[PDB]
């Protein structure tokens with residue numbers, strides 16, 4: 573009695589999404605249309621299945637519960653975690669991210685390593701009260717900290733030369749180095765690597781297999797790496 577059967581017979585694929593994640597899954601302000609990388613992924617899957625997508629709004633706090641309860645067939649991208657996998661299935665991953673450091677480009681030879689940013693003479697900008705700030709204290713215990721309060725942005729301090737570096741997700745960094753060509757990712761790998769995947773019911777092997785099969789097929793023609801580039805996004809190796 574797999575969801576695969578129900579999706580094909582009904583002609584409808586139900587997709588749970590928060591719609592508040594630029595540029596993975598957003599709603600267009602005026603029109604209220606869903607757009608973004610995960611939306612295009614789901615459009616392609618429904619096209620290949622010969623079915624229509626139904627978007628089912630949810631929030632971060634309930635999006636996993638929407639899978640467990642059967643409010644939708646599949647989620648948009650979420651971070652795969654052991655805790656989440658106790659209750660939900662995940663598809664294969666198509667996007668790897670982690671924490672990386674940003675500096676001004678001109679200061680690359682000076683700050684080419686994590687260790688170079690961990691020094692009494694270096695200032696690291698952080699955002700006050702965040703997860704990110706706690707990680708900066710872990711990675712750069714010898715450095716001087718500039719902890720600014722939202723809405724002030726940590727990266728703006730780096731732009732202004734008031735701090736030498738900051739850290740953020742590779743996703744955000746990729747976006748920032750696009751917008752501010754004067755910035756660069758310190759090329760010394762990433763910390764706390766993690767993976768985005770779609771959730772499906774933990775108890776429906778047949779549907780889980782079907783989506784993984786489709787992902788494998790798409791990967792063989794570079795579909796996801798091309799779609800990531802469409803959005804100027806890039807997966808870590």
Ligand SMILES: C[N+]1(CCCS(=O)(=O)[O-])CCCCC1
Nearest residue numbers: 592593594632649650651652
């Ligand atoms: C970066 N992000 C997504 C995190 C989603 S997670 O699966 O990791 O729980 C964007 C939207 C709000 C929440 C934070």
